[PDB]
A and B are shown apart, each in its own frame.
Chain A
Amino acid sequence: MNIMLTLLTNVTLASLLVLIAFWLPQLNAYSEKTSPYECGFDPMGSARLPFSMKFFLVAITFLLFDLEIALLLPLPWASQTNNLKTMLTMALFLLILLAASLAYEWTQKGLEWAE
């Protein structure tokens, strides 16, 4: 209940602001006011052709690293155990491989952004 009412109120408030955004200010528009903005002169035709960036390698390792943080998230409740020696060894073990993966990723070009 409480959480969904808050979620509902926010989207209605946001949507109402859109509705008064596009309707209260009346429009006198044409085909040149809808032209894409390219700092003045005519665009050469772009914005949907393959725009290949370079950080794809580190973009996808973020996904791998984001899974590491998922694995080590339960640590606050993991400390409340009776065998901390095993918990400590395993907790540092995940951090070590996370550090090891970053270090090996670093050494082989890795974080460097392709030219």
Chain B
Amino acid sequence: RGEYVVAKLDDLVNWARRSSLWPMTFGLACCAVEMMHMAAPRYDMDRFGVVFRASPRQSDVMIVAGTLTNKMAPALRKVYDQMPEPRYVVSMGSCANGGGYYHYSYSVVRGCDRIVPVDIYVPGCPPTAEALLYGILQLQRKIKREKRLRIWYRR
């Protein structure tokens, strides 16, 4: 059946996507320190296929770790627009989610959402390195439930 063939093919692509996420570190504030602890051998982010890779031309997901200051807000959008785009954005910490501690400041945007679309939200201040691992695991589940080929077959 055509639907079955597109079903297996979609799963193959989705497996290839979720099993290789290459974060482009936007290390901004104390949320970045905890994320490096995820890369530390205690949790070993690398072991899940997900390994840190620079050059957003060669990265799949953004991990917004820290406050997003209005001065650098154009930089966040520019590095987001340059990713080969099967692409997702992970927001770490209360500050990146909706402003957090500095929600009422004059120079902190109330959440990274106002600049970029945001996938799974990671709450914390900072979210423990284990909590982020759960977040990345959630994105892998979200990638697993992608029906890109099924929608194309039913267009």
Contact = CB atoms under 8 A, between A and B. Distances in A.
A33 B85 CA distance: 9
Counting chain A CB atoms within 10 Å of each CB, the highest count among B55, B74, B75, B82 belongs to: B82
Contact of A33 (B55, B72, B74, B82): B82
Say what secondary structure dominates the interface of chain A: loop
Contacts of A33: 81-85
A83 interface: no
Interface string B62-77: 0000000000101100
Interface string A17-47: 0000000000010101101010011100000
A35 B74 contact: no
B56 interface: yes
Given A37-B55, A37-B56, A37-B57, A32 B81 contact: yes
Contacts, number: 26
B114 interface: no
B79 interface: yes
B78 interface: yes
Chain B's interface size range is 10 to 19
Contact of A35 (B55, B75, B81, B85): B81
B78 A40 contact: yes
Contact of B75 (A28, A30, A32, A41): A41
Contacts of B82: 32-33, 35, 37
Interface string B41-72: 00000000000000111000000000000001
A30 B81 CA distance: 9
Contacts of A41: 74-75, 78
Nearest to B152: A26
Interface of A: 28, 30, 32-33, 35, 37, 40-42
6 closest Cβ pairs, A-B complex: A40-B75, A32-B81, A41-B75, A40-B79, A33-B81, A40-B78
13 contacts: A28-B85, A32-B81, A32-B82, A33-B81, A33-B82, A33-B84, A33-B85, A37-B55, A37-B56, A37-B57, A40-B72, A40-B79, A41-B75
